[PDB]
Amino acid sequence: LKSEAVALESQTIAPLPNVTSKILAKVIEYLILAANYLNIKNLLDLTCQTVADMIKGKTPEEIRTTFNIKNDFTPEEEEEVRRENQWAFE
Amino acid sequence: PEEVLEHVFSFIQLDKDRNSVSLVCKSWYEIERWCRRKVFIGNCYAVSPATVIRRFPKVRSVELKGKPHFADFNLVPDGWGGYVYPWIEAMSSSYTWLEEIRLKRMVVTDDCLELIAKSFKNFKVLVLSSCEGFSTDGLAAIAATCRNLKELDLRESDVDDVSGHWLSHFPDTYTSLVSLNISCLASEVSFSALERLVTRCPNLKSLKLNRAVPLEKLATLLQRAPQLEELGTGGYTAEVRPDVYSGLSVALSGCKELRCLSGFWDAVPAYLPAVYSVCSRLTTLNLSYATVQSYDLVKLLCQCPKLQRLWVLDYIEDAGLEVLASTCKDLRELRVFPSEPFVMEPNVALTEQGLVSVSMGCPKLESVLYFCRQMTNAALITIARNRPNMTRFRLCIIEPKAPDYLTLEPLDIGFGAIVEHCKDLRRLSLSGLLTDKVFEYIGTYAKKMEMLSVAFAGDSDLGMHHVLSGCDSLRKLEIRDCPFGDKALLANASKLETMRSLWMSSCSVSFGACKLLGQKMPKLNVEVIDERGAPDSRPESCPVERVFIYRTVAGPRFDMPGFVWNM
Numbered sequence: 312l313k314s315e316a317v318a319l320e321s322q323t324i325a326p327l328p329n330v331t332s333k334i335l336a337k338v339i340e341y342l343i344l345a346a347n348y349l350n351i352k353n354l355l356d357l358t359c360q361t362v363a364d365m366i367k368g369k370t371p372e373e374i375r376t377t378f379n380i381k382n383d384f385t386p387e388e389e390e391e392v393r394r395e396n397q398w399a400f401e
Numbered sequence: 402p403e404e405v406l407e408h409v410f411s412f413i414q415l416d417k418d419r420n421s422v423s424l425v426c427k428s429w430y431e432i433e434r435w436c437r438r439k440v441f442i443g444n445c446y447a448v449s450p451a452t453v454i455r456r457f458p459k460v461r462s463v464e465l466k467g468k469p470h471f472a473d474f475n476l477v478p479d480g481w482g483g484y485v486y487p488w489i490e491a492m493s494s495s496y497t498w499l500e501e502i503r504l505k506r507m508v509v510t511d512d513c514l515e516l517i518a519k520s521f522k523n524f525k526v527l528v529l530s531s532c533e534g535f536s537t538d539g540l541a542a543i544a545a546t547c548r549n550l551k552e553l554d555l556r557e558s559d560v561d562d563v564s565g566h567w568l569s570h571f572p573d574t575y576t577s578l579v580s581l582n583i584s585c586l587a588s589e590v591s592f593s594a595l596e597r598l599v600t601r602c603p604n605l606k607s608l609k610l611n612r613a614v615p616l617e618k619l620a621t622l623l624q625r626a627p628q629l630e631e632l633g634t635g636g637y638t639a640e641v642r643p644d645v646y647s648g649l650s651v652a653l654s655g656c657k658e659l660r661c662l663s664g665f666w667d668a669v670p671a672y673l674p675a676v677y678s679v680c681s682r683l684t685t686l687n688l689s690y691a692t693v694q695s696y697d698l699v700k701l702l703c704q705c706p707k708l709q710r711l712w713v714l715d716y717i718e719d720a721g722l723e724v725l726a727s728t729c730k731d732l733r734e735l736r737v738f739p740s741e742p743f744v745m746e747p748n749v750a751l752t753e754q755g756l757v758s759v760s761m762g763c764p765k766l767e768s769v770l771y772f773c774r775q776m777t778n779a780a781l782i783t784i785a786r787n788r789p790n791m792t793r794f795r796l797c798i799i800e801p802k803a804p805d806y807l808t809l810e811p812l813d814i815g816f817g818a819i820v821e822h823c824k825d826l827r828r829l830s831l832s833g834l835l836t837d838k839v840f841e842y843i844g845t846y847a848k849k850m851e852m853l854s855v856a857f858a859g860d861s862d863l864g865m866h867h868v869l870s871g872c873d874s875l876r877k878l879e880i881r882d883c884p885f886g887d888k889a890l891l892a893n894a895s896k897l898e899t900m901r902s903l904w905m906s907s908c909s910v911s912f913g914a915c916k917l918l919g920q921k922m923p924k925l926n927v928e929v930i931d932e933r934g935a936p937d938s939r940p941e942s943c944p945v946e947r948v949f950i951y952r953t954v955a956g957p958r959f960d961m962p963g964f965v966w967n968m
C-alpha cells in the first residue's frame with residue numbers, strides 16, 4: 312500500500328493517492344475521510360458515531376463552534392425554521 | 402462530504418437533536434431533512450400535512466396527537482375534530498415506504514384504515530391510542546391486507562364492535578405479528594383463529610387479550626407462545642377447579658420472559674396465585690380492573706421484588722401500600738385508582754398515609770397518580786422532602802375543594818413544598834382547596850414544569866398570571882372550573898406562543914377577550930367551543946363554555962364543526 316486480511320477490510324483496496332502515510336498508519340493499526348475513501352464500514356461507523364457524539368445535546372451555535380461552520384441563514388430564515396421545528400416537530 | 406454527514410446523522414435520532422442539527426447551516430438543513438426517519442406532531446393542527454411531507458420526504462414513521470387531554474373527561478364535544486384522513490390521504494401519494502403510524506386521540510375511520518392497507522405495502526406498526534371513529538370492518542381490512550404487520554395496538558380506543566370475525570382475516574401465510582393489543586374490544590374473536598394466529602407467529606412478544614377470552618382458555622394460548630414478554634389476560638374468572646388452576650400455573654411458569662401482566666377482569670382471588678411463578682421477575686403489574694381485596698393484593702405484591710410500575714385500585718389500602726413500600730425498592734411509578742368514585746364516604750381504608758409510606762420506602766419512586774378522599778399539608782410536605790426526585794405528581798382528591806382535613810387550611814403550602822423540593826417536576830395535577838397562593842408557589846418554584854392541570858382552584862386572575870409569568874418550561878396548561886378569566890390571558894398573551902396549548906373550560910373567559918386575543922395573536926388559533934349557538938347572540942362579556950388556544954404554523958383549520966369558532 313502506497314500513501315492480506317488487514318488490506319481486504321477496505322473494499323476500495325479489495326496505491327492510495329488520497330491517504331497520507333501518517334493517517335494510513337492509523338488505518339492499518341485499526342480519519343473519517345480515509346475510512347470513507349477506503350470504504351471500510353466499521354472504521355466509518357466508529358468515526359461517524361464519535362462525530363455524532365460531538366453533536367448530540369448541543370445547540371446550533373455550539374455545533375458550528377466545535378466544527379468551524381458559518382451561519383449562512385438570514386435572520387428571517389433562521390426564525391422560520393426554528394419556529395417550524397419547535398411548533399410542529401417537537 | 403454529503404455521504405459522511407448523512408451517516409453521522411444516522412446515529413442522531415432524537416427529535417430535538419435533529420432540529421438542532423437542521424439549524425447549524427443551510428447544508429446541514431438539507432442533508433438532515435432528506436434522511437429524517439420519524440416525525441412527532443404533538444398537535445395535528447399545528448402544521449399541515451403538505452408542509453410535513455415536503456420538508457421530510459423520506460419519513461417512515463409518523464406520530465400524530467389530536468384532542469387535548471381533557472377529552473378524557475369528556476370535555477371536548479363530539480365532532481370537535483382531530484380527523485386523520487387528510488394526513489393518510491396526503492401521505493398515501495408521497496410516503497410510499499411508510500412503516501409506522503401512531504395516533505392518539507384522533508378520529509380514525511374505516512376509510513382511513515382501508516387507505517392505509519392499500520397505500521403502504523411495507524406497513525408494520527399501527528398504534529391507535531384513545532382513538533375513535535372506526536369499526537371491526539376497518540380492522541378486517543388491515544388484517545386481510547397488511548402482509549408485513551408487526552404491531553396492532555388499540556389501547557383505550559372506542560371501536561364500533563360490529564363482529565369479532567375481523568381477526569380471521571389474517572391469512573395463513575401471515576406470521577410477522579410481534580404485538581397485539583385488543584383489550585378495548587367488546588366483540589369475541591374466533592378463539593380457534595386466535596390460537597392459530599398465535600401458533601404461527603414466533604416473534605409474538607406482547608399479547609393483550611380482550612375480556613371475551615375466558616380464563617379457562619388462557620393456558621392454551623400461553624402454551625403456544627412461551628416467548629411472551631407481556632401478557633394481558635382476558636376474563637380471569639372460572640369455577641374453582643384444581644385442573645384449571647394447575648394448567649394455568651404450568652403455562653404461566655413456562656413463560657420465562659414474562660415481565661408485564663395486565664387484564665384480570667372479574668379476577669377471582671382463588672386464581673391469582675397461578676401468576677406467582679412470574680412474580681419474581683415482573684416489572685409491570687396492572688391490577689386496575691381487579692376488584693380483589695387488600696390481603697390478596699398483598700400476597701401477590703410480597704413476591705414482586707423487581708416491580709417498577711404498579712397500577713392498582715384503592716382496595717390496596719394504606720396497609721397494602723406499607724407492604725409495597727418495604728417489598729418493592731425498585732418501584733418507579735404508582736397509580737392508585739378509585740373503586741367507588743361516586744361515593745363520598747370512604748369505602749376503603751386508603752388515605753394520605755399510603756402515599757406517605759411509599760414516598761419514604763421507595764427511593765426511585767418518581768411518578769404518582771393517586772386518588773383519595775383526604776389529604777394534609779403535613780403529608781404533602783413529608784412526600785416532597787422524601788422524594789425530591791419526583792418528576793410526575795398527580796393527586797386527585799375526590800371531593801372538590803376539600804381542605805387539609807386536620808387543620809382545615811387550603812393545600813397551598815403542601816403543594817408549595819412539592820414544587821419547592823421537587824426541582825425536576827415536569828407534570829403536576831392539583832386538587833383540594835387551593836387559593837391564589839399555590840399558584841404563586843408554582844410560578845416561583847416550578848421552573849421545570851411542562852404540564853399543569855387545574856380543577857376547582859384559585860381565587861382570581863392573579864393565580865393564572867403567576868403560572869403564565871413564572872413557569873419557564875410550560876408546554877400544556879389545562880384548566881376547568883376556576884375563577885380565571887380575561888385579565889391573565891390577555892396580559893400574558895405572548896407566553897401562549899411558547900406553549901403547545903392552553904385549555905380553559907367552565908372558567909370566566911369572556912367572548913370579548915377571545916375575540917381580542919385572536920386579533921392580537923394571528924399565529925394562535927383561539928377556538929371558542931360552545932354548544933349554545935353563536936357567541937355573538939349573547940353579550941361580549943358573557944363567559945364562553947370552553948376556549949382552546951394553540952400556536953400553529955398552519956393557521957385556522959378547515960374542519961371546524963358548527964359549535965367551534967376561530968377568532
Ligand SMILES: O=P(O)(O)O[C@H]1[C@H](OP(=O)(O)O)[C@@H](OP(=O)(O)O)[C@H](OP(=O)(O)O)[C@@H](OP(=O)(O)O)[C@H]1OP(=O)(O)O
Binds near residue numbers: 793
Ligand atoms: O410529551 P407529551 O406529548 O407531553 O406526552 C405526554 C407523555 O406521554 P408520551 O409518552 O406520548 O410523551 C406523558 O407521559 P408521563 O411522563 O406523564 O407518564 C403521558 O402520560 P401517561 O403516562 O398518563 O400516558 C401524557 O398523556 P396524558 O396527557 O393522556 O396523561 C402525554 O401527554 P399528551 O396528553 O400530550 O399525549
